[PDB]
Amino acid sequence: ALDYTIVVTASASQPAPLLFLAPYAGVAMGEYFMYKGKHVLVVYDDLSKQAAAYRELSLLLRRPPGREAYP
Amino acid sequence: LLDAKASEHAARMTAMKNATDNANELIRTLTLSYNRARQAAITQEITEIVAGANAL
Amino acid sequence: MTRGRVIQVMGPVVDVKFENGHLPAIYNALKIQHKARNENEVDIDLTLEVALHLGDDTVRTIAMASTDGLIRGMEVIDTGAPISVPVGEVTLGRVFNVLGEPIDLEGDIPADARRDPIHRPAPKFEELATEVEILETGIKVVDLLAPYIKGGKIGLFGGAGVGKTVLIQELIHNIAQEHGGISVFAGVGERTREGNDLYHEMKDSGVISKTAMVFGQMNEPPGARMRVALTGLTMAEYFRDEQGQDVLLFIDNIFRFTQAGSEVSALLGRMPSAVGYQPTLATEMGQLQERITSTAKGSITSIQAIYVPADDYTDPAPATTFSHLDATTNLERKLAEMGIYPAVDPLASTSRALAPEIVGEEHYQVARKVQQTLQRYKELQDIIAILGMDELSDEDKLVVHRARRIQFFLSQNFHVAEQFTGQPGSYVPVKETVRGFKEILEGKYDHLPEDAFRLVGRIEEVVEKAKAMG
Amino acid sequence: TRGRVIQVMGPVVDVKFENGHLPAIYNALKIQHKARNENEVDIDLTLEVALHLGDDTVRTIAMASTDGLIRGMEVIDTGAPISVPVGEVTLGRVFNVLGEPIDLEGDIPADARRDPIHRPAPKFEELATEVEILETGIKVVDLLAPYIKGGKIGLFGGAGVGKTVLIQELIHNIAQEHGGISVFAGVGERTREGNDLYHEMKDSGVISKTAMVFGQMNEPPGARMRVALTGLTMAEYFRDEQGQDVLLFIDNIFRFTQAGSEVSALLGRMPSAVGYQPTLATEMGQLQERITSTAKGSITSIQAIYVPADDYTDPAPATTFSHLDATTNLERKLAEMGIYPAVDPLASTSRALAPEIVGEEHYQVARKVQQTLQRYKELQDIIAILGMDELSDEDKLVVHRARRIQFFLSQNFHVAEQFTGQPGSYVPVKETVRGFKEILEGKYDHLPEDAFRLVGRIEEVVEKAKAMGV
């Protein structure tokens, strides 16, 4: 399956800035082929961890919380 | 046969009485857990609101 | 000089700034008497209680009435003390607000009277009573099943037409009759027309001449309703300290004290504790109810109504009231429909004093046998509703025939009900009711009708009623 | 009179003008910036004024993305709020928030008049005195959940049930029978589904009567705020000038409130209960009170509502529901059964289903249809498990007339003509009340279970049953 797939990894030891920008980097790599005529499947494994990373990212930038302290 | 039918109706009566007793015990334990979850929900939402007010 | 002026008004919260070194201490009273200079001003008679020291010679206060009309720069005088509330024989038969001012329309108390501070530390460990003694009331369900304690806190679970006010009123009458003390009713944050009804009930029953009534109602700010139980308590403290007598102190809906403290905490800007209650919940309940004690010379016993919100006994306001309760009396509507007055539920009402080291061995054994017969009678009502009165047993028929006479002997003729029924009422000593329930449990009065036991004080009045009936 | 950017805080941009040259609240600001070098990005933004800060500084809300903004960029003041073109020019054209054509059919010239987004609600002097019923031609809608002329409707439906087809024949029926323009406003909901709805506008011929405004989930929440107001100020031209009975479709008004909750946390407001902005009731009412029927025309509004996790207690569905007059609940179990439209008859309610509005006969027939369909939705498990042979010969009459009513609730649509070949029908209220009355009386029990399927009137039932041989 690696003849046609691209793995984008943002592990837990990496800072939450890199977990925040992982789906947007993945969908940018996808839309490069989408605006050329190709067909792309983008799998976002655990976007809830992106939500936790962006919650961390907003609480450390001192933005006001909401419910469950998500911004 | 009549004695067995009488014992049938009495056994179904005792079984449904025990079913009501088990259902009521489940009601009271679930209301204890309901009150615990109710207190936890209100203290969670008040901590969220006052943290958001302290954020400003 | 001790006159500063207002800097901020925000709802019930008023910030007042004095000079340096001349700030008032926490919990003092601050008076604002202002006459309107122009047509663009409002006459103001307002009283503030000091809550915090914010710094820069400023003081954050809470209000006792409405803050509508206050001007930044209006002068505030320092009383040099907390809220001074009059005490003594001039308070009996009188209705007061939270400031110790008479709501009643006869007259005002002169300025030479003794006035005690609201905020007082609890009586010391040197001064408490070493023993646990029993506050004898004359009510047979109280004196037999849920005994009260001099210095104890007692919960009333009831209201809405079961007989709470009649029980309150007969307690005042019996204590002021036999023990020589007085009572103080502190209506903390309840309905004003119910306070009017309770006033007129105590007025036409003659009970009011031996009690002192304090009302801070719903229309007052939370800073007023937080201090109503304390300003009735400082009236009861005079009678147990300077007179040295056993005093009742009623707090209608002690839950209103907790939620008024919660509202004052939310207005003051504190971070709330679990369930929205103030962080200071347990210590405010303690600072109320550690002054309700039995000291060496007198005592304050306290009968308190508890709401138990959302029917939850693990809610922090019931969970902090219950750690000070020494007894519980439960008024049941099924006993008020049956004709039993008082409507105290005999099996649900519990007490800490019901123990053989306090009441004695005979009192304890008679009370436990009464509880066992009534519990077996409640376990037999479904058999009576299913199988019928016949073919149950002989011993179980004896238990029913015993427990009905026990259940109807629990009721009394009250002195309060003399004006409605004509029957003069009775004070039943605790030895008399222990001996009476013991003679019932032995089977001495099985031949008598069960309606002879209804609304009867002692165990000779029931046989005189049975001789008068047949 | 042209100021600098101070802060760019997500979608919120802070702009400072000169002293005395501040814009009023809700005015549209413009940023038109050409890249001075390779280190800059060309930017065309529209900001609306939201707050006034201290030193000539204005917090704004962005309509597009703020990525690329430099502190110190010049901001153009327009002196007016967001102006949006209205008239016959908007018919058949797809618009964004700013009143610019999304589609490539052309651009609107500057000679056409442009109504502002923000407008006060119609006064109490100007509204209609009593309720008129907006007649749709749909038998479920006209019978069981009548739409009032000028009120608000809640579609509770997902996908695969036929929400878009119901929308399109509402547009067609009000266009051919009332002369009514419709306006579709897509508020933050699934760009793909808006594309599907637009291509079905094009296929059905419905597009020539409809003005369409799309701001979807991709756009920042200021755009998702102002979309519904753009569609509403397009509908208000036809009401206040042409005197028409205008439709105004807001898809998922929950997004109009949660976009406000996304903006308000960054504007600097304290969070309200459940994380929703504090000004949620007023921001909902300033939308919902401009949807009224005045003396000149009318604006009735069918509004899809997505309830998150089917929780009807969070404040934003509560304040959408408090403005509703009727609901039509689209059920998948009726769409799989073959009933088009798949309006759930028992769960869809209305404020107008009352005999002072619909009349006595319509109210009695509708109430009896609801009673027989509710009696039919109590035997569903019994029919599914125990069978038809075992029920009773009195309840199988109930399920007999219930199936004859339940299949007569479906219509042939005008917009479904291109899919099936059947021309479609507009059914008046009197004829559908007469038809359901004749089915309830039992005149059509001998006709089969079909021939009620997908017909307009009851004479069409007779003709289709004669075409089936019966």
Token reading at C250: 């009623």
Token reading at D259: 């976009």
Tell me how far CA of residue C58 lies from CA of A38, C6, C21, C23, C54, in angstroms.
71, 9, 11, 8, 6
The letter for the amino acid at D421 is G
The 3-state DSSP class for residue B36 equals: helix
Q: How many CB atoms lie within 10 A of CB B18?
A: 10
Q: How many CB atoms lie within 10 A of CB A29?
A: 14
How far apart are alpha carbons D464 and D453 in whole angstroms? Answer: 9
C-alpha torsion sign, points D248, D252, D253, D255: negative
Do residue C274 and residue B50 have CB atoms under 8 angstroms apart? no
Among this protein's residues, is C191 annotated catalytic?
yes
How far apart are alpha carbons C200 and C206 in whole angstroms? Answer: 10
Long-range contacts of the stretch A40-48 (C-beta < 8 A, 24+): A47/A23
Question: Are D and A neighbours with ≥3 CB pairs closer than 8 A?
Answer: yes
What lies within 8 Å, CB to CB, of D371 at 6+ separation is none
Fill in the DSSP letter of residue C116.
Answer: E
Q: What are phi and psi of C331, to 5 degrees?
A: -90, 125
Do residue B48 and residue A63 have CB atoms under 8 angstroms apart? no
Task: Beginning with the edge strand found earlier in the chain, give each strand of the sheet holding D4-9 in spatial order.
Answer: D4-9, D12-16, D57-62, D43-52, D27-33, D76-81
Contact C337, C364 (CB under 8 A): no
DSSP strand pairing (D114-116 vs D83-85): antiparallel
Contact D121, D268 (CB under 8 A): no
Residue C341 known to bind ligand: yes
Q: Cα B21 to chain center, whole Å?
A: 12
3-state secondary structure C319-385: HHHCCCCCEEEEECHHHHHHCCCCCECCCCCCECCCCCCCCCHHHHHHHHHHHHHHHHHHHHHHHHH
User: Given C191, C270, C333, C435, which residue is catalytic?
Assistant: C191
Please note each residue after which chain A is broken, C-to-N distance over 2.5 A, or write none.
none
Q: Cα C99 to chain center, whole Å?
A: 19
- Structure determined by: cryo-EM
Q: What are phi and psi of D204, to 5 degrees?
A: -80, -10
Do residue B53 and residue D274 have CB atoms under 8 angstroms apart? no
Fill in the DSSP letter of residue C177.
Answer: I
CA distance D182 to chain B (A): 41
C-alpha torsion sign, points D102, D105, D110, D116: negative
DSSP strand pairing (C115-117 vs C246-252): unpaired
Q: Cα D412 to chain center, whole Å?
A: 22
Token reading at C227: 């201090």
What lies within 8 Å, CB to CB, of D262 at 6+ separation is D11, D221
Which of C470, C451, C207 has its CA nearest to residue C340? C451
Q: Work out the angle at residue D139's Cα, subtended by the Cα atoms of residues D133 and D145, and round it to the nearest 5 degrees.
A: 50
Token reading at C281: 């919940």
Please tell me if residue B23 touches chain D, with a CB cutoff of 8 Å. Answer: no
Task: Beginning with the edge strand found earlier in the chain, give each strand of the sheet holding D182-187 in spatial order.
Answer: D94-95, D210-215, D182-187, D245-251, D298-304, D152-156, D326-329
The 3-state DSSP class for residue C249 equals: strand
Which residue's structure tokens are 């939402």?
A: B45
Contact C291, C122 (CB under 8 A): yes
Token reading at D148: 């009032």
CA torsion, ordered C81, C83, C84, C89, to nearest 10 deg: -160
What lies within 8 Å, CB to CB, of A39 at 6+ separation is A33
How many beta-carbon pairs under 8 angstroms link B with C?
27
Residues in A touching D275 (Cβ below 8 Å)? 66-67
How far apart are alpha carbons C440 and D9 in whole angstroms? Answer: 83
Please tell me if residue A67 touches chain B, with a CB cutoff of 8 Å. Answer: yes
Give the residue ranges of DSSP H helices in B1-56: 2-54
Q: How many CB atoms lie within 10 A of CB D445?
A: 11
Tell me how far CA of residue C445 lies from CA of C144, C218, C374, C436, D380, in angstroms.
19, 51, 17, 10, 63
CA distance C408 to chain B (A): 31
Contact D213, D251 (CB under 8 A): no
Q: Which residues pair with C300 in a beta bridge?
A: C247
Which of C211, C228, C226, C230 has its CA nearest to residue C292? C230
The letter for the amino acid at C452 is A
Tell me how far CA of residue D275 lies from CA of A60, C18, C303, D259, D280, in angstroms.
20, 40, 43, 12, 11
Q: Which residues pair with C351 in a beta bridge?
A: C327
What is the per-residue DSSP string for C193-226?
HHHHHHHHHHHHTTGGGGEEEEEE-TTS-HHHHT
Tell me how far CA of residue A68 lies from CA of A41, A55, C365, D316, in angstroms.
31, 10, 56, 18
Q: Provide the terminal-to-terminal Cα distance of chain A, rounded to the nearest Å.
A: 38
How far apart are alpha carbons C18 and C1 in whole angstroms? Answer: 9
CA distance C257 to chain B (A): 20
CA distance B45 to chain A (A): 8
The 3-state DSSP class for residue C183 equals: strand
Fill in the DSSP letter of residue C311.
Answer: G
Residue D296 known to bind ligand: no
How far apart are alpha carbons D414 and D429 in whole angstroms? Answer: 18
Q: How many CB atoms lie within 10 A of CB D462?
A: 15
Among this protein's residues, is D4 annotated catalytic?
no
Among this protein's residues, is C190 annotated catalytic?
yes
Q: Cα C409 to chain center, whole Å?
A: 26
Biggest CA pair distance of chain C: 89
Q: How many CB atoms lie within 10 A of CB C238?
A: 21
Question: Are A and C neighbours with ≥3 CB pairs closer than 8 A?
Answer: no
CA torsion, ordered D247, D248, D253, D259, to nearest 10 deg: 180
Contact C33, C79 (CB under 8 A): no
- If 0-12 CB within 10 Å is exposed, 13-18 middle and 19+ buried, where does residue D300 land? buried
Which of C313, C249, C321 has its CA nearest to residue C284? C321
Tell me how far CA of residue C70 lies from CA of C18, C46, C53, D110, in angstroms.
17, 9, 21, 56
How far apart are alpha carbons D232 and D214 in whole angstroms? Answer: 13
Q: Which residues pair with C3 in a beta bridge?
A: C77
Which residue's structure tokens are 């998150």?
A: D308
How far apart are alpha carbons D258 and C152 in whole angstroms? Answer: 54
User: Given C170, C190, C237, C263, which residue is catalytic?
Assistant: C190
- If 0-12 CB within 10 Å is exposed, 13-18 middle and 19+ buried, where does residue C459 land? buried
Do residue C315 and residue B36 have CB atoms under 8 angstroms apart? no
Fill in the DSSP letter of residue C131.
Answer: S
Contact D155, D303 (CB under 8 A): yes
Contact C317, C259 (CB under 8 A): yes
- If 0-12 CB within 10 Å is exposed, 13-18 middle and 19+ buried, where does residue A59 land? middle
User: Given D59, D93, D149, D163, which residue is catalytic?
Assistant: D163
C-alpha torsion sign, points A44, A46, A48, A52: negative
The letter for the amino acid at D358 is V
What is the per-residue DSSP string for C3-61?
EEEEEEEETTEEEEE--TT-PPPTT-EEEEEE---STT---EEEEEEEEEEEETTEEEE
3-state secondary structure chain D: CCEEEEEEECCEEEEECCCCCCCCCCEEEEEEECCCCCCCCCEEEEEEEEEECCCCEEEEEECCCCCCCCCCCCEEEEEEECEEECCHHHCCCEECCCCCECCCCCCCCCCCCEEECCCCCCCCCCECCCCCEECCCCHHHHHCCCEECCCEEEEECCCCCCHHHHHHHHHHHHHHHCCCCEEEEEECCCHHHHHHHHHHHHHHCHHHHEEEEEECCCCCHHHHHHHHHHHHHHHHHHHHHHCCEEEEEEECCHHHHHHHHHHHHHHCCCCCHHHCCCCHHHHHHHHHCCCCCECCCEEEEEEECCCHHHCCCCHHHHHHHCCCCEEEEECHHHHCCCCCCCECCCCCCECCCCCCCCCHHHHHHHHHHHHHHHHHCCCHHHHHHCCCCCCCCCHHHHHHHHHHHHHHCCCCCCCCHHHHCCCCCCCCHHHHHHHHHHHHHCCCCCCCCCCCCCCCCHHHHHHHHHHCCC
Fill in the DSSP letter of residue C134.
Answer: B
How far apart are alpha carbons D439 and D283 in whole angstroms? Answer: 46
D177: left (phi over 0), alpha (psi -120 to 50) or beta: alpha
How far apart are alpha carbons D33 and D215 in whole angstroms? Answer: 24
